[PDB]
Amino acid sequence: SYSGYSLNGGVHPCLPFYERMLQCAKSEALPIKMCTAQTEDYLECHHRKKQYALNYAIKKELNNIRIVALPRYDEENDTFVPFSQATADHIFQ
Amino acid sequence: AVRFVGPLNIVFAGVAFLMFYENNYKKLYLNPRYSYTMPYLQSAKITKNLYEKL
Amino acid sequence: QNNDRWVYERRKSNFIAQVDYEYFKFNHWRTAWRYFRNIFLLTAGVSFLYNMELDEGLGGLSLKYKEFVKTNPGQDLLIGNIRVTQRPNGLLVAVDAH
Amino acid sequence: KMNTKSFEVLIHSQYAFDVCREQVYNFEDCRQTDTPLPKDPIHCKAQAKEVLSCYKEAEKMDPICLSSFNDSRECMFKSDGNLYNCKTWINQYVTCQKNPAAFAEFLEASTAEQLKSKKFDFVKNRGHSDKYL
Amino acid sequence: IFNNYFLYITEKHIKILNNYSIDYFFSIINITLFIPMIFLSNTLFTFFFLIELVSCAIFYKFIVSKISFKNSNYKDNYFSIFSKNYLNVLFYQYWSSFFSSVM
Amino acid sequence: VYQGFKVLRRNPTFYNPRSAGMVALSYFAYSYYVNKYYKPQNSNFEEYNSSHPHNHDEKVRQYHEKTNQAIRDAVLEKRAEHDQRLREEAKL
Amino acid sequence: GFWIAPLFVNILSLPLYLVMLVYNIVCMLLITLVIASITLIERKVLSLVQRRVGPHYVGYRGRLQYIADALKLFIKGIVVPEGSNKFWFVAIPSAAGAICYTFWINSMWGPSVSIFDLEYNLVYATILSILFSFCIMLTGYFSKSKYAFMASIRCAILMLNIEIFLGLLVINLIFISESFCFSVFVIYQEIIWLIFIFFGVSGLIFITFLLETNRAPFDLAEAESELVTGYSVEYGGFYFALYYLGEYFHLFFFSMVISIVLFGGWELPNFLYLFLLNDFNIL
Amino acid sequence: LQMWGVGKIIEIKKFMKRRDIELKGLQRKAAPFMQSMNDVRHLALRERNDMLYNELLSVHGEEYAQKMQKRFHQTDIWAPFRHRYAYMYNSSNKNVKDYKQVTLSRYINGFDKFNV
Amino acid sequence: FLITITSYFSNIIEFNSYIINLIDFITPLFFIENFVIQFFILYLFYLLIVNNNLYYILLYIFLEIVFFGLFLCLYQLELFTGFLWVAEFAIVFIAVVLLFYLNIDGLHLKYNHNINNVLYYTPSLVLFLIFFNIDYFSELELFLPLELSFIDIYDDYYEGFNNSIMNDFTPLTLSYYSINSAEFIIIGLLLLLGSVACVNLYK
Amino acid sequence: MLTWISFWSLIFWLILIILVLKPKNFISILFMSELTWLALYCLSLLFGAIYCDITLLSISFFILGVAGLEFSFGILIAILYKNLNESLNTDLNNNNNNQNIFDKNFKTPLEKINWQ
Amino acid sequence: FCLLFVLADAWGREKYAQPYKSQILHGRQPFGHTFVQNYRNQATDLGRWNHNFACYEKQPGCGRDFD
Amino acid sequence: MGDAVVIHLIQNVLIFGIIFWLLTWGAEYFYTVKQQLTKKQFYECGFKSISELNIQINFNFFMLAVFLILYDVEFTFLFPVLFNFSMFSTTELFLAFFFIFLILVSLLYDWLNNVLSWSAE
Ligand SMILES: CCCCCCCCCCCCCCCCCC(=O)OC[C@H](COP(=O)([O-])OCC[N+](C)(C)C)OC(=O)CCCCCCCCCCCCCCCCC
Ligand SMILES: CCCCCCCCCCCCCCCCCC(=O)OC[C@H](COP(=O)([O-])OCC[N+](C)(C)C)OC(=O)CCCCCCCCCCCCCCCCC
Ligand SMILES: CCCCCCCCCCCCCCCCCC(=O)OC[C@H](COP(=O)([O-])OCC[N+](C)(C)C)OC(=O)CCCCCCCCCCCCCCCCC
Ligand SMILES: CCCCCCCCCCCCCCCCCC(=O)OC[C@H](COP(=O)([O-])OCC[N+](C)(C)C)OC(=O)CCCCCCCCCCCCCCCCC
Ligand SMILES: CCCCCCCCCCCCCCCCCC(=O)OC[C@H](COP(=O)([O-])OCC[N+](C)(C)C)OC(=O)CCCCCCCCCCCCCCCCC
Ligand SMILES: CCCCCCCCCCCCCCCCCC(=O)OC[C@H](COP(=O)([O-])OCC[N+](C)(C)C)OC(=O)CCCCCCCCCCCCCCCCC
Ligand SMILES: CCCCCCCCCCCCCCCCCC(=O)OC[C@H](COP(=O)([O-])OCC[N+](C)(C)C)OC(=O)CCCCCCCCCCCCCCCCC
Ligand SMILES: CCCCCCCCCCCCCCCCCC(=O)OC[C@H](COP(=O)(O)OCCN)OC(=O)CCCCCCCCCCCCCCCCC
Ligand SMILES: CCCCCCCCCCCCCCCCCC(=O)OC[C@H](COP(=O)(O)OCCN)OC(=O)CCCCCCCCCCCCCCCCC
Ligand SMILES: CCCCCCCCCCCCCCCC(=O)OC[C@H](COP(=O)(O)O)OC(=O)CCCCCCCCCCCCCCC
């Protein structure tokens, strides 16, 4: 069964989606066709297929030559500065 | 020149040396180095701040 | 005795002793080393060399643009039929010059 | 974000919780949810930034507080982050921070034993029924 | 209901002749008590555990099968007769249970 | 290892080095085959969400997605209209 | 230097591993000396019980008796029986020695004074004891002496009993501490030693201690009257020295375990002034 | 003796719990600021990843990139992606280090950074 | 420079777009520890295949248990590693005693595995390996840079100070005594009935 | 080289193949069955960690108990082999010729087939 | 005998205040337990959940803050 | 449970045993071993052993191991409730007592049938 607990006794991360899916299934007269959104959200939170597809696409893009240098992160101001600009915290300096 | 080891062995030694040197170089000069990972190369000073390069 | 019948009728041939001149050469281990180095080269060495060359090129382009901005900021760097341009968010991208 | 270490952040927060109370309340209200699962930080980013700015403002201390802050830091170093064991020193730091003018008389009314170097060794002095929690 | 009817017939047969021990019918009692609970299973997990318990009970029943009878054959008093039926039953039941359980 | 030599005399490296090498080579080849060819084929992520998918499975998946979206939109619109009509009739 | 530094990244760390090895060697040598002193103490205590002087002339007043016996065990020559398996005959004592010299890792000498940050100390102790019993059984089997094999079977029976006995003791103990770490017991034992709760089963605790230590009345594996010597009837020299060292290591460390889990560990007996003590101090 | 000792142990446990109440209060006082810092860092990393994903995927099309990034129909629930969920140490990590650091830091000085 | 060399006839972007597929195909992605663990598991399987001595079979089963525990430790399930080891070392001990009782000398059946290996097992295994993969989309480590993953750094301090647990048995108790208590009781009854069956089999 | 999910999914059936492949000696089959149960134990723990499923994590002790009970039954059957006069090597319990065995040879318990 | 004694004592502990009644009859379990146990439980009907304090509205002293 | 320090300590323990190996080898210099007929034969209290490698024992106490296999798991099932007994409720208390009672009844049945003692075979 779906206990709904985490691995430290907390709450399973899928519990909101599972509750929504069960509520929709109970309420709808045609749960299979009318709860597609909730069921897909639950299945996504469970399997993470879409994130794996995104990671696969990102790996292919990284293999392709399009990115040279990402902007540095100024943590003091919580901003992003272009890699071209020189900063004290910069690795190369 | 004359070599007791074969050309393939020479190629293996060269590529292995390149792998070793490139790995160490990227770990030593292209790293934030906020964590003490290479002893005797990063400083062992006492840091008074969250981020201090070692 | 029928349980041990096989051993009774087994025909065992006396050993012939010969001097082994290539025992210490470890030819089987030499063959293992040859196979290992061939596979290692063909896959890992080629992949590492190509990836290292790509990384060196990307780092060189980054440093070249970093130096180029000082001389003239805002101009895209053209090198090797490639255009290196900085997006407004600050992300350098290399695209086809043409 | 702060360039400050964890235990020092805890010590500073023990006082800052009373100066930026409205910001803390705003952040808590923003992050409130109907389930124990955490809320997305993207919604509470603004309140978090406000809280952090107020914390930056509060982290400043008078020089007279330096001795109390240092002894609290030593206590929190010798004990691996146990706030309860070091609350007395943290409480002294909070008192010095709040109305530092009276901390002069606080220190003046000090005994010979109190006017001594404070060394902490919890292995040698475990305490009384310390659960470490 | 079916278990009750079969138990009734078995009682009549036992009154006719007794070649079955009390442990045999204690195992039957356990099987009858625990086997109908399977249809109340709401999850495959509980179904697996219930069927495992029932399988243990059936293995108990097979273990308590009578082996040696007091027949009218007086020719094997001083000779060894080998019968492998008991081991075959136990072996096959045990390994079938193992395969089914793991799968 | 106390008495390391006496302990490692018989089996320094392997008992059947040839078979150990065959095991290693088979494991390497099978991992290569799976990861590079077989699992990617089953995952079918090469043309995922492509605007012009050339794969029948991807086309079917996109058809399912668009059809479900259309069904949800139509039913939501119809339910909104039905609720509005009921509310209007209530105050009469 | 810029282009030479990468070559030494992995070369400058080997001295650190050497230092770690040196520290481990020092700890193992010190614990070996402790066990040797324990053997001398055992001889002297038995001498007191039997009203005799005991070791008195190996070193002035018998101060170096353990050193002498260790050196003699090193010196003694060893021969493997022809019928016995040469590989296993030496492999088993080597594994036993490795396990016995690994025993000391699962020891605490303070609130967190342990070489490693281990939590499942009781699990480690059980596993190490099972491994040592494995080694004893294999020793008895591969030394084809019938007496040694019977000693191995006796060791198996002792292990069977120890499983349930020590498991039940640990089950009762964890019910209070709620952890397998030795430290968590002392915090509860500060006021009263945990042995007071178990005072009724004090006899069973004594039985458990003796059974785990393989001391009388539980010296069945090494019974020298029922069997010639026991599992070591065909082992001499340092091969037998290793088994003796392992037995004494187990004795010492299980004595430590009992002291920590039931007798306050490193807490003084404050229960002797319980009536006069105050539970709070409010100014 | 058994009954009295069990009672005494329960007394000790309840005293520990009494002090745990105050420890929890102090931890609550310190919680909001550390949570804010952690959230800001988490959002900074998310922004970097979003920029990288947009740059990499926008070549095929803005709609394609949006479809790839979108994961949930209903966004009222936050479900971070994880390859696995931590179990040991109350879903925490004891050794936030490399294996080499974990081995060496127990014997060699300089690896620990003295968080005070 | 590769860019300079390519610029004479094409662009580095095009050259990479053409060669990167082959580079990825020939790129080996793995960690040394994972490779070692998996190889030793498979090698122990091979040793089990080729060894008929019961004592060595038991030794290799024990080593397989050790390597399973090592994998669990690497995956950070240390508590389950310890429980597995304590539960199974006793089983191995009892197995050694059983081997002493039956087949003490260690002499085994004279069996030739080559005949069946070439007749049925090698081709059947080849077909099964060719057509068997249940892993749908799981990705290896090193598939993407570790710097892209960020969730593991997230910490929930509110839940942390609201959490009072101190042991790693909380899921186990919530399962055996709260949720799966039905199966817990079924296991208890099963063990009792199994003890009865064992006694009857002894009789 | 292989993801843990695929590795464990494959090695479970590989262990079953080994169990079937090895010569049928009851003790060896019992050891292989124990190994199969432990493979299921590891696989269940892996999936429980992946999916944050306390039920999958808790399946560990259920598997341990079932394996223990089956091992007890196997020990009893192996001991019962003696009283039933059956070789542990089951292949020797029948007269069918087997090329896999070097020295399988059975004769009728007689001394002379022809008397006259 | 000990079980009967403790059960009788537990049923007699109803005289004491709510926090000191027998835990056999009254449940006191962590927030992870209580939330899942009483999420949609109309029998208890505790109400909404306080996220940052990990308790329901109707539980005594759910949100206890300083000052 | 530890970390890689445990494996490194295993390696260190092996290196330590190499020290005893060196001492044992060095000790070889202070004695000579002559070859004699019975010097490398099995010891049987001063007489030749009739049988070697056929040393089968009688495992007539196998029921104890059989029951140990079950009771180890039964005891292992009790650990989580003992660890988290501060969280006990009516259901958990009832289940723990139920399980302990089952263990006691199984032990009582074993005692009644007298399978906890040595038998003729
Ligand atoms: C024992 C201590 C170490 C154990 C752990 C070691 C690390 C983990 C295991 C790694 C695999 C090691 C296997 C070596 C076995 C060698 C056996 C042998 O000598 O066989 C010779 C045999 C026999 O030698 P031969 O044929 O010359 O002599 C025999 C002659 N006849 C046939 C006539 C009898 O050669 C072969 O035919 C088969 C060779 C197979 C070699 C396989 C090498 C490994 C393949 C995988 C490489 C993957 C590389 C990935 C790189 C990634 C980037 C870093
Ligand atoms: C911690 C304890 C330390 C002390 C331990 C004791 C040390 C001293 C004894 C050690 C050896 C044991 C005694 C051997 C006596 C017999 C000598 C003999 O016949 O030869 C021995 C062995 C012979 O092996 P073999 O081929 O005969 O093995 C088969 C054995 N039988 C016949 C039983 C089946 O010599 C060698 O194998 C040497 C060549 C191969 C060495 C191993 C290569 C692969 C693993 C290492 C890889 C290293 C890195 C390079 C690879 C690529 C890396 C990226
Ligand atoms: C923190 C942990 C602390 C504990 C660590 C303890 C580790 C101690 C290690 C000591 C050194 C041991 C030698 C290691 C070096 C390699 C040895 C080697 O050459 O291997 C070849 C041999 C195996 O190959 P082989 O050469 O004997 O024969 C091959 C098989 N045939 C011939 C049939 C083809 O390895 C061993 O067997 C070594 C065993 C050493 C003793 C280990 C005892 C452990 C406890 C019992 C386990 C269960 C046994 C059950 C079955 C009954 C017994 C068989
Ligand atoms: C792990 C090691 C063991 C730990 C055990 C836990 C501690 C228990 C301490 C003792 C508590 C009392 C238990 C019951 C004793 C009953 C004695 C008895 O039978 O008396 C009548 C006996 C004999 O009377 P009897 O009637 O029983 O038998 C005699 C029979 N007739 C009458 C026919 C002659 O009289 C005595 O002599 C009793 C002397 C008792 C002295 C006990 C001293 C024990 C000292 C060692 C204890 C361990 C100390 C550890 C310290 C650790 C510090 C860190
Ligand atoms: C018959 C002969 C009998 C011989 C009996 C000897 C018994 C065994 C004694 C072992 C313990 C000896 C301890 C000596 C002091 C060691 C100090 C040390 O290592 O520094 C740690 C210190 C720890 O300092 P650290 O932790 O601050 O190091 C990190 C430093 N930063 C951060 C800058 C990187 O390590 C170092 O100094 C670094 C270099 C280490 C180089 C390797 C040292 C090996 C020492 C081997 C000693 C062997 C003695 C043999 C004697 C033989 C006599 C015949
Ligand atoms: C020269 C030839 C070399 C040939 C190859 C060498 C083969 C060596 C085989 C044995 C060692 C294997 C090491 C790799 C696996 C490491 C697993 C791991 O990650 O654990 C650390 C992990 C550490 O994980 P962690 O929880 O600290 O998390 C680490 C966090 N990050 C990822 C950020 C670094 O261990 C644990 O978590 C729990 C502690 C486990 C302690 C186990 C103790 C017993 C070990 C007995 C080994 C006996 C081996 C010899 C005898 C048997 C035959 C092999
Ligand atoms: C960190 C602290 C470290 C402390 C370490 C302390 C340990 C010290 C160990 C000392 C060992 C001494 C061994 C002496 C061996 C020679 C004597 C002998 O055995 O005689 C029998 C045989 C000779 O027998 P024989 O035929 O001459 O007979 C002698 C008897 N009489 C006198 C009557 C004739 O040994 C030999 O074969 C001698 C020649 C070969 C050996 C030569 C010396 C080699 C030294 C190797 C040192 C290796 C060091 C490794 C270091 C790293 C370890 C990891
Ligand atoms: C200039 C800039 C740098 C350019 C790149 C340089 C890269 C490094 C060098 C790569 C080449 C290394 C040499 C490879 C030799 C291969 C020889 C061979 O395959 O012959 C079979 C070989 C011989 O058998 P043996 O047992 O040794 O007996 C001797 C019999 N004459 O048998 C063996 O020993 C075993 C052979 C194993 C073969 C494994 C094949 C793996 C193929 C993987 C896919 C590769 C596809 C091509 C990728 C190209 C990408 C650019
Ligand atoms: C502590 C808490 C509680 C837990 C306690 C845990 C107790 C664990 C008990 C372990 C017992 C170990 C001793 C017994 C087994 C010894 C190994 C063995 O028997 O091997 C059998 C099998 C291979 O056998 P075979 O193919 O015949 O060749 C033998 C080569 N060793 O073996 C195999 O399948 C694989 C064997 C691999 C051997 C690897 C040797 C590596 C040597 C490294 C030397 C140092 C350098 C290390 C470098 C590391 C770099 C990362
Ligand atoms: C766990 C280790 C520590 C021991 C903890 C448990 C202690 C249990 C005994 C507590 C005191 C009981 C006092 C009874 C007084 C009384 O009625 O006394 C009535 C009579 C008095 O007889 P006398 O005239 O000889 O004094 O005694 C009895 O009836 C004896 C009752 C049995 C006592 C045996 C010891 C306890 C064994 C465990 C309990 C099960 C007993 C079953 C008996 C059939």
Token pair in block for residue A62: 């990284």
Q: Is A88 helix (H, G, I), strand (E, B) or coil?
A: coil
Distance CA G171, CA G198 (A): 13
Phi, psi of A67 (to 5 degrees): -110, 130
Listing DSSP states for C13-79 in one string gives PPP-----SSGGG-HHHHHHHHHHHHHIIIIIIHHHHHHHHHHHHHHHHHHHHHHHHHHSTTPPEEE
User: Does the Cβ of G201 fall within 6 Å of ligand 10?
Assistant: yes
β-bridge partners, A5: A11
Which approach determined this entry?
cryo-EM
Determine whether the interchain pair I11/C80 forms a contact, defined as Cβ–Cβ distance below 8 Å.
yes
Phi-psi region of C15 (alpha: psi -120 to 50; beta: other; left: phi over 0): beta
Please identify which residue in the block is written with the tokens 């609130």: G111
Atom of ligand 8 lying closest to residue C46 CA: 7
- Asked if residue G180 lies in contact with residue G106, where contact means CB atoms within 8 angstroms, the answer is no
Token pair in block for residue I45: 């399987």
- Count CB atoms within 10 A of the CB of residue G278: 6
Please identify which residue in the block is written with the tokens 């199974």: I88
Give burial (CB, 10 Å; 0-12/13-18/19+) of I191: buried
Distance CA J28, CA J17 (A): 13
I156 at interface of D, judged by CB pairs closer than 8 A:
yes
Distance CA J16, CA E102 (A): 10
Q: Out of I64, I73, I149, give the residue to mutate to test ligand 6, the one with the largest number of ligand atoms within 8 Å of its CB.
A: I73
Distance CA G91, CA G134 (A): 13
CA distance D60 to chain K (A): 23
Closest CA to D106 of D60, D68, D133, D77: D68
User: Does the Cβ of G200 fall within 6 Å of ligand 10?
Assistant: yes
Distance CA J32, CA J13 (A): 12
CA H66 to chain centre: 29
β-bridge partners, C78: C83
How many A from CA of F15 to the centre of ligand 3?
Answer: 13
Distance CA F37, CA D66 (A): 65
| E45, E60, E63: residue with CB nearest I183 | E45
Phi-psi region of G267 (alpha: psi -120 to 50; beta: other; left: phi over 0): beta
For C16, residues 6+ apart whose C-beta sits below 8 A from its C-beta are none
Distance CA G31, CA G97 (A): 13
Distance CA H92, CA I183 (A): 29
Residue of H nearest to C90 (CA): H51
Q: Which residues line ligand 5 (CB under 6 A)?
A: B 39-40, 44; G 15, 18-19, 22, 25-26; H 108-110
The type of residue at I37 is I
Determine whether the interchain pair F6/G98 forms a contact, defined as Cβ–Cβ distance below 8 Å.
no
CA G81 to chain centre: 30
Token pair in block for residue I198: 């064992």
Give the CA distances from residue A41 to residues A6, F2, H71, J53, in Å, rounded to whole numbers and listed in that order. Answer: 19, 60, 8, 18
- Count CB atoms within 10 A of the CB of residue E57: 26
Distance CA I54, CA J27 (A): 8
Phi-psi region of G154 (alpha: psi -120 to 50; beta: other; left: phi over 0): alpha
Q: Is J101 helix (H, G, I), strand (E, B) or coil?
A: strand
User: Alpha-carbon torsion A31, A33, A34, A40, what sign?
Assistant: positive
Helices (H), G50-120: 65-75, 86-102
User: Does the Cβ of L26 fall within 6 Å of ligand 7?
Assistant: yes
Q: Out of G86, G89, G134, give the residue to mutate to test ligand 3, the one with the largest number of ligand atoms within 8 Å of its CB.
A: G134
Q: Which residues line ligand 6 (CB under 6 A)?
A: H 95, 97-99, 102; I 33, 36-37, 66, 70, 73-74, 76, 78; L 1-4, 6-7, 10
Token pair in block for residue B4: 């007791």
Closest CA to I52 of I129, I2, I114: I114
- Count CB atoms within 10 A of the CB of residue F58: 18
Closest CA to B36 of D23, I68, H109: H109
Residues of A in contact with J55 (CB under 8 A): 1, 3
Distance CA K29, CA L93 (A): 13
- Count CB atoms within 10 A of the CB of residue A44: 19
How many A from CA of G20 to the centre of ligand 5?
Answer: 9
> Crossing angle, helix I181-202 and helix L62-76, to 10 degrees?
170
The type of residue at L68 is L
G277 at interface of D, judged by CB pairs closer than 8 A:
no
What is the CB-side half-sphere exposure of residue I72 using CA atoms within 13 A? 29
Cis peptide bond upstream of G217, omega within 30: yes
- Asked if residue L49 lies in contact with residue G228, where contact means CB atoms within 8 angstroms, the answer is no
How many A from CA of L70 to the centre of ligand 7?
Answer: 53
Which is it for strands C92-96 and K49-50: parallel, antiparallel or unpaired?
Answer: unpaired
Helix or strand (DSSP H, E) at J65: helix J54-84
Phi, psi of K55 (to 5 degrees): -165, 160
User: Does the Cβ of F17 fall within 6 Å of ligand 1?
Assistant: yes
* Residue located nearest, by CA, to atom 19 of ligand 2: F9
Distance CA L13, CA F2 (A): 10
Q: Out of H109, H111, H112, give the residue to mutate to test ligand 5, the one with the largest number of ligand atoms within 8 Å of its CB.
A: H109
Please identify which residue in the block is written with the tokens 């012009």: F52
Distance CA I34, CA I43 (A): 14
CA F71 to chain centre: 27
For J15, residues 6+ apart whose C-beta sits below 8 A from its C-beta are I45, J32, J35, J36, J39
Closest CA to G102 of L12, L3, I67: L12
CA distance C37 to chain A (A): 26
Helix or strand (DSSP H, E) at K56: strand K55-56
- Asked if residue H33 lies in contact with residue D52, where contact means CB atoms within 8 angstroms, the answer is yes
DSSP 8-state symbol, G76: S
Rounded to 5°, angle at Cα J54 from J53 and J60? 110
Closest CA to L68 of A80, G166, B22, H50: G166
- Asked if residue C80 lies in contact with residue I12, where contact means CB atoms within 8 angstroms, the answer is yes
CA distance I42 to chain H (A): 25
K31 at interface of D, judged by CB pairs closer than 8 A:
yes
Distance CA I25, CA F40 (A): 12
Distance CA L83, CA G177 (A): 8
A69 at interface of C, judged by CB pairs closer than 8 A:
yes
- Count CB atoms within 10 A of the CB of residue C7: 11
Closest CA to L63 of I201, J30, G167: I201
Distance CA I101, CA G176 (A): 41
Give the CA distances from residue D106 to residues D12, D69, D95, D111, in Å, rounded to whole numbers and listed in that order. Answer: 20, 15, 10, 11
Counting ligands in written order, the one closest to the CA of G246 is: 3
* Residue located nearest, by CA, to atom 1 of ligand 7: G22
Atom of ligand 3 lying closest to residue F8 CA: 19
Phi-psi region of H91 (alpha: psi -120 to 50; beta: other; left: phi over 0): left
Per residue, what are the HEC states of E31-74?
HHHHCHHHHHCCCHHHHHHHHHHHHHHHHHHHHCCCCCCCCCCC
Rounded to 5°, angle at Cα G157 from G152 and G163? 120
Residues of L in contact with K25 (CB under 8 A): 90
| I39, I47, I136: residue with CB nearest F43 | I136
Token pair in block for residue L8: 């490194």
| J65, J75, J79: residue with CB nearest L73 | J65
Q: Is I70 helix (H, G, I), strand (E, B) or coil?
A: helix
Residues of D in contact with G112 (CB under 8 A): 123
- Cα(first)–Cα(last) distance of chain K, in Å? 50
Determine whether the interchain pair G87/F10 forms a contact, defined as Cβ–Cβ distance below 8 Å.
yes
Reported resolution in A? 2.8
What is the CB-side half-sphere exposure of residue A68 using CA atoms within 13 A? 27
Distance CA G253, CA H69 (A): 58
DSSP 8-state symbol, A5: B
Percent of chain G that is helix, strand, coil (3-state, to 5) = 65, 0, 35
DSSP 8-state symbol, B5: S
For C59, residues 6+ apart whose C-beta sits below 8 A from its C-beta are none
Q: Is E98 helix (H, G, I), strand (E, B) or coil?
A: helix
CA F69 to chain centre: 23
Closest CA to L70 of J70, E59, E49, J34: J70
Q: Is L108 helix (H, G, I), strand (E, B) or coil?
A: helix
Please identify which residue in the block is written with the tokens 């525990």: I69
User: Does the Cβ of B11 fall within 6 Å of ligand 8?
Assistant: yes
- Asked if residue C51 lies in contact with residue C36, where contact means CB atoms within 8 angstroms, the answer is no
Closest CA to A6 of H31, D31, J48: J48
DSSP 8-state symbol, L37: T
User: Alpha-carbon torsion J81, J82, J87, J89, what sign?
Assistant: positive
Which is it for strands K49-50 and A72-74: parallel, antiparallel or unpaired?
Answer: unpaired
G199 at interface of H, judged by CB pairs closer than 8 A:
yes
* Residue located nearest, by CA, to atom 44 of ligand 9: L11
CB within 8 Å of chain J, chain E residues 13-72: 45, 49, 52, 56, 59
Q: Out of I63, I72, I74, I83, give the residue to mutate to test ligand 9, the one with the largest number of ligand atoms within 8 Å of its CB.
A: I63
Helix or strand (DSSP H, E) at A72: strand A72-74
How far is it between the farthest Cα atoms of chain J? 82
Token pair in block for residue E23: 């442990």
Please identify which residue in the block is written with the tokens 């390996």: I129
Residues of F in contact with I28 (CB under 8 A): 32
Determine whether the interchain pair K24/L97 forms a contact, defined as Cβ–Cβ distance below 8 Å.
no
